[PDB]
Design a protein around this ligand. Structure first.
Ligand SMILES: Nc1nc2c(ncn2[C@@H]2O[C@H](COP(=O)(O)OP(=O)(O)O)[C@@H](O)[C@H]2O)c(=O)[nH]1
Ligand SMILES: [Mg+2]
Length: 168
């Protein structure tokens, strides 16, 4: 069975964990420890093809990342770059995560999708047009999602898988 290692990155609080849990477990989580980084697997069918999705949900903040206990970006085949549409700071930070991915992969050609999450919220501050302009400058798809309503959730992950299949 074909395996796809996807990595979800972005600023703290944008919904990386909520997006992952919604895709895998079909439930919206109202809170999820921001320091929890883990892989979540689920068998899906995308465009008729069976595959095993391995999703690495990252913390997004060095503060949360190192908040460990008694205990990759390298192995990831595609990346979801998430901001929240009611979080201008998370959008302003997207370039940092984009540069991180290219550095850790030593490539300009990495499968990647820009995700604008929380589109169920009315207090929007990032316009769809400006997120689209940013995605065009990277040459990557832009997808609006809501981990709460499920809008765009499958589409964001499936598009990333399709970008990986295109990348061979
Ligand atoms: N209304 C709404 N809230 C969301 C959405 N996605 C995440 N949240 C909330 O945003 C907060 C942070 O989400 P979380 O997944 O922990 O963000 P993370 O730090 O990037 O993993 C949580 O309280 C979630 O319930 C969404 O699409 N819509
Ligand atoms: Mg999280």
């Amino acid at each position: 069975m074909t395996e796809y290692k996807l990595v979800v990155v972005g600023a703290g609080g944008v919904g990386k964990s909520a997006l992952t849990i919604q895709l895998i477990q079909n439930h919206f989580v109202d809170e999820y420890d921001p320091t929890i980084e883990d892989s979540y697997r689920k068998q899906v069918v995308i465009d008729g093809e069976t595959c095993l999705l391995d999703i690495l949900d990252t913390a997004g903040q060095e503060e949360y990342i190192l908040d460990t206990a008694g205990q990759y970006m390298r192995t990831g085949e595609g990346f979801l770059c998430v901001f929240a549409i009611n979080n201008t700071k998370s959008f302003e930070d997207i370039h940092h995560y984009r540069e991180q991915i290219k550095r850790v992969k030593d490539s300009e050609d990495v499968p990647m999708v820009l995700v604008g999450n929380k589109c169920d919220l009315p207090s929007r501050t990032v316009d769809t047009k400006q997120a689209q302009d940013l995605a065009r400058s990277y040459g990557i798809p832009f997808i609006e999602t809501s981990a709460k309503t499920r809008q765009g959730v499958d589409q964001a992950f499936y598009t990333l898988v399709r970008e990986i299949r295109k990348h061979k």
